[PDB]
Structure 1
Amino acid sequence: TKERQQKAEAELKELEQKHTQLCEEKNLLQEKLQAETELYAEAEEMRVR
Structure 2
Amino acid sequence: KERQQKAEAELKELEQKHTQLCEEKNLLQEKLQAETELYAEAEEMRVR
TM range (shorter): 0.7 to 0.9
Give, in angstroms, the shift of residue 48 of structure 1: 2.1
Question: 5+ unaligned residues in a row in structure 2: which ranges?
Answer: none
Tell me the equivalent position of 1:38: 37
How high is the TM-score relative to the length of structure 2?
Answer: 0.78
After TM superposition, the runs of 4+ consecutive aligned structure 1 residues lying more than 6 A away are: none
Question: 5+ unaligned residues in a row in structure 1: which ranges?
Answer: none
SS at match of 1:39: helix
| Distance (Å, rounded) in 1 between the aligned partners of 2:36 and 2:11 | 37
How high is the TM-score relative to the length of structure 1?
Answer: 0.77
Q: CA RMSD in A?
A: 1.3
**How many residues are treated as equivalent by the alignment?**
48
